Amino acid sequence: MKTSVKFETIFPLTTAPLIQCITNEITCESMANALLYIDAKPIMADDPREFPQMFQQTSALVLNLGHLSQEREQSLLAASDYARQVNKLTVVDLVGYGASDIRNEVGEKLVHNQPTVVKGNLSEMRTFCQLVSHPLDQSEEAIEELIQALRQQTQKFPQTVFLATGIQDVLVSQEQVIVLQNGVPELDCFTGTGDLVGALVAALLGEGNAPMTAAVAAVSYFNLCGEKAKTKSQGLADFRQNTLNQLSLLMKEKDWFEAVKGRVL
Amino acid sequence: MKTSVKFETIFPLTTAPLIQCITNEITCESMANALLYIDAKPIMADDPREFPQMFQQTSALVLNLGHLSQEREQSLLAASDYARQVNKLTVVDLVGYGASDIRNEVGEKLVHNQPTVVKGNLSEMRTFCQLVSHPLDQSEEAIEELIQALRQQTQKFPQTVFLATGIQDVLVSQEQVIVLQNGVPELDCFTGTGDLVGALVAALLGEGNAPMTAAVAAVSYFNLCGEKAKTKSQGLADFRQNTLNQLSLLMKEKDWFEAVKGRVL
Amino acid sequence: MKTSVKFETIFPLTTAPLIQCITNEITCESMANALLYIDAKPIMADDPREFPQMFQQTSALVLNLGHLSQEREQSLLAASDYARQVNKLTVVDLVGYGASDIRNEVGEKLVHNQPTVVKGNLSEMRTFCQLVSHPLDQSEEAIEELIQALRQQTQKFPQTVFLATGIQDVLVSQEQVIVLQNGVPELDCFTGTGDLVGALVAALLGEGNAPMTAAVAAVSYFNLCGEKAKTKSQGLADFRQNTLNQLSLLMKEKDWFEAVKGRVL
Numbered sequence A, B, C: 001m002k003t004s005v006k007f008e009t010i011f012p013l014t015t016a017p018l019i020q021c022i023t024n025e026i027t028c029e030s031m032a033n034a035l036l037y038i039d040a041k042p043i044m045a046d047d048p049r050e051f052p053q054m055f056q057q058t059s060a061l062v063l064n065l066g067h068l069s070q071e072r073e074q075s076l077l078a079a080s081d082y083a084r085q086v087n088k089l090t091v092v093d094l095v096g097y098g099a100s101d102i103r104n105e106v107g108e109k110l111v112h113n114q115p116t117v118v119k120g121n122l123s124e125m126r127t128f129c130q131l132v133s134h135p136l137d138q139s140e141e142a143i144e145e146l147i148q149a150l151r152q153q154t155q156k157f158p159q160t161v162f163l164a165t166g167i168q169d170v171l172v173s174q175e176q177v178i179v180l181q182n183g184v185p186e187l188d189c190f191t192g193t194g195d196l197v198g199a200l201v202a203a204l205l206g207e208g209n210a211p212m213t214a215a216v217a218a219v220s221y222f223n224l225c226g227e228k229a230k231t232k233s234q235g236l237a238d239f240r241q242n243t244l245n246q247l248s249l250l251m252k253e254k255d256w257f258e259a260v261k262g263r264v265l
């Protein structure tokens, strides 16, 4: 990949950044492990009463829309407002956007507070951009449609980078459009791959990387962990285990990023 | 096993059914993974505000009694009523029935809404049938006692199949009594085997299988995954990993179901 | 280790003790598995409405301060009061103590009810003892400072054993001061090692062991599982898997405890 992104220097993380995750109860054990496996320090606290003291210590924040409830709604909106008040680097992951009105309402509010990164899968982001969601949507036509939609969003949210994940990943900012083409289809066959990509982005933001760099490196690294894992694995449980294991190993190969496939458009 | 159940055709699932799990926070990561490993699509949302929109999309529902709380109680009773109003295929898993009055009260209400399948372990189901719970209860006498008790229940709940899990599994409907004898004792030595069997039943119901077929195939497949896993495993963590891994592999053997042991009584 | 602690007899557990965990949602799947892997029987129920009936059945209780919320606060304080009223053996794990006032307030209340064991990492326990938390704090000076601080606490809480975990582990009671030196640094690189040590202590208390014995054996066994796991492992996911696996295997070596390193001071 012909790119401005300086991959050689991303890993290992050296500041042990504290990454606070206001996240769902389904994938949180694995999100905490992911973050530790790349030398970040996870904290999963979400009680608003702690925010003043916590936010002083954290380097970045994950606001994950998954498994909504009245309690998670209070935390998410409280953390989003507060993150805006104190300029906390923030990744918003629109898990389930489009599933219901209530999710959409909460999701829209998070994005309105102008986070560092907004993230989702193709379906969620298309829905966020008010496009139809019919895959047919991974076509070159549909990708170009979403790129344009996301570029219109970055005009309203000019300090926010948008990430849509899929067979190809689409990253859009006010400055760049990047399409990435790593990973394997088995990365859809265990729970939390999207959630963990969110946490990895936050981790890189917290270490000090620029937003598009954080997004491109997090997605690339995780997807290349999948690629390696597929070669070593038989069965999906085993494939999952190896992907998570690679988070701590792929790093050690001086030239892991040579496998990155993607265009800056 | 001399049986009417057409195992050859159960796997692989081809409709990618969306299975909604209103379940406990202990085993939910593994329930989501289980469902993905057999090509179902898990959704763990439980906020009643979403139900109208979600229920339009889901193919089957898991209502798991585990880790009760006031929030889980509202979700469970709301989902149970609504599932009845719209005839959603539903598996009720009476995790912990007998532990407390409050669990029993919630549990009874779920069963009163007449789900497709009611499930628990021997102890829970015996208690549900108002039998003593003293194992002594896995004896041929005690099994025959429970069969009769469950047959009396299917008279009140004639559209519901009952599953009691154990060394031997007991399945009772208004039409059939089946005893299954697969699995290994190590399937009691990691958390969630019962919970995942519930989710697998829902998955098969959602794909389109008849209830007793769904129950018999889910239990058999999971227990045969255990049998295979034991031959490859040393240590319980390792045994767990391999059981979960087999969910995605055993399927691929054209004749996995030849290992099924059980009588139609 | 020259010690009064009779390790030969700790494992295997033979009473299948029921250990109730009022714990965080991050590491609970693994805490339940841990307990099963050493032949305890986990129950993760935390609704106060069940306590009267549950407490009749449980052998020991884990009160984990992690992932605080208004719901977890009610459960924790309710369970702590009740455990005191009925003399339930209780392990209090001060996860996150020092992070916020609200955590501290809840934590102090748990310790004020005089549990069997209070546990945390060096940082948390130092903060509990009102010491500064700057590692510099693992020095021989800082260890001696904490020992003295903990001895002053056991004067207020003379029926409570205190455990501070780290490179070296510090155990203090009114009768003994013990420093342990097993484990490997990778035990900080997956989530829940501290949480699981808490559950293991409870498990040994529930089986019938004296408090300091329970604490010393739980910490030693878990840390020696890590030591073995490191020799078999490549990558952190893999190291985690093997540590958890060893919980069920190391036991089987007649002389596992010969590897224990530590002084009674």
Ligand SMILES: Nc1ncnc2c1ncn2[C@@H]1O[C@H](COP(=O)(O)OP(=O)(O)O)[C@@H](O)[C@H]1O
Pocket: A095, A120, A121, A122, A165, A166, A167, A168, A169, A182, A183, A184, A185, A186, A187, A188, A192, A193, A194, A195, A197, A219, A222, A223
């Ligand atoms: N079919 C695929 N081929 C290659 N990479 C994939 C595929 N599906 C998902 N991924 C990758 O795995 C990660 C998870 O993305 P995705 O599954 O789209 O998230 P979600 O869990 O929110 O639906 C992303 O980094 C994505 O690039």
Ligand SMILES: Nc1ncnc2c1ncn2[C@@H]1O[C@H](COP(=O)(O)OP(=O)(O)O)[C@@H](O)[C@H]1O
Pocket: B095, B120, B121, B122, B165, B166, B167, B168, B169, B182, B183, B184, B185, B186, B187, B188, B192, B193, B194, B195, B197, B219, B222, B223
């Ligand atoms: N001792 C055993 N031998 C064979 N199969 C077992 C044994 N214990 C449990 N199983 C199987 O494992 C699955 C889990 O059942 P069980 O452990 O009874 O559920 P629960 O977790 O609700 O107590 C069931 O399909 C059951 O048939």
Ligand SMILES: Nc1ncnc2c1ncn2[C@@H]1O[C@H](COP(=O)(O)OP(=O)(O)O)[C@@H](O)[C@H]1O
Pocket: C095, C120, C121, C122, C165, C166, C167, C168, C169, C182, C183, C184, C185, C186, C187, C188, C192, C193, C194, C195, C197, C219, C222, C223
């Ligand atoms: N660097 C280390 N070297 C040896 N053992 C360790 C190390 N770090 C942690 N442990 C051990 O692993 C277990 C987890 O302790 P710790 O990581 O301090 O808990 P927490 O998760 O609460 O911070 C303890 O039994 C401790 O002795």
